[PDB]
Design a protein around this nucleic acid. Structure first.
Lengths: 197, 197
RNA sequence: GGAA
RNA sequence: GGAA
């Protein structure tokens, strides 16, 4: 739920942008209304905006969160944005992809670039699977494939049958067959290492 | 709350109609009991009747309010009527629609018919969204669509993500799919103008 | 929140 | 479940 500190933060951001909805006035009100909010409250207000359908304003709270010190690239955080994005929206579709790009960049910008070893290894499987599954739902095939190819195939993050099953079905159901065949191959290799006899 | 002037106004209207409930005797008691009541008191008595379930009597206080000098077409005022209407009532369902018709007519009858420029532009988004959302709740799809098509699409009233989300889900959830697809299109166009990069 |  |  929302603390009275958060609910009022959302209220403010809306009353402010009520008069000016342009993108420059948005991040101005977002930064002002969600400026030094405790990690917990900021994160909540962000999801509260998503819930209400104010996606653009949620992205604003996302740019504010990035400028905070506790901000970390979270697969789940992004999954939310992907899920709460307007369907049948070419503009939004792009933002979703650009978002997925930001995530991977941020992730590999941390102690990566040559990390001993791996930004992606040790990543939360469940949360990562949620982002992927979410993208495959909105139909961002290419975008879903990039997270996989980067975190599982190149990133060396060990996932499970559930993850593969999601990607395999996803890619095959969104046209990317060469991709689907690869996922089935990775799984084949997975099942080879874990199956018994 | 109700002023002693209002509470007694409601009391009267009821005691009067108690003997005669017919529609002609209603507006007769409504006009008599709520005749020169201060804008504030009249409006309150109206909502008090709604609250009690006396919808027909609320409509009577609405016809009296229309004949007043301070009366203005208010999206919220109507939303109340739509909300307080008896569910599963074919008779009431019609009145709700006729009500929505009255609203748009009244709105465009003012300084409109060629206003430089727009009766609808500058309208209160929140209040307008409440009427729409209220109609979509009672399931008056066509009626909800008319307010949108007139105020947002033709009226040129600039709304937000929350408004679209309401209409998009509403139309799609009430059978009007062609309508829903259009709302998603308007939003797409909205998100194109306001999203970043 | 555009608020049993 | 990686959860109208």
């Amino acid at each position: 739920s929302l603390s009275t500190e958060a609910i009022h933060a959302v209220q403010a951001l809306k009353r402010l942008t009520a008069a000016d909805r342009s993108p420059p006035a948005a991040t101005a009100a977002a930064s002002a209304a969600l400026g030094r909010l405790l990690r917990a409250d900021l994160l909540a207000a962000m999801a509260e905006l998503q819930r209400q359908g104010h996606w653009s304003l949620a992205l604003a709270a996302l740019h504010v969160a990035r400028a905070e010190p506790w901000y970390r690239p979270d697969p789940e955080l992004y999954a939310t944005f992907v899920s709460s994005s307007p369907s049948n929206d070419p503009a939004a579709a792009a933002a979703v992809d650009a978002l997925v790009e930001a995530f991977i960049e941020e992730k590999e910008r941390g102690a990566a670039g040559g990390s001993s070893e791996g930004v992606w290894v040790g990543e939360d499987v469940y949360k990562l699977t949620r982002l992927v599954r979410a993208l495959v739902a909105k139909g961002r095939a290419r975008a879903a494939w990039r997270v996989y190819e980067a975190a599982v195939r190149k990133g060396g993050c060990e996932v499970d049958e559930y993850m593969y099953r999601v990607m395999a079905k996803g890619m095959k159901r969104l046209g990317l067959d060469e991709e689907a065949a690869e996922v089935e191959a990775d799984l084949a290799d997975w099942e080879a290492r874990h199956l018994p006899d």
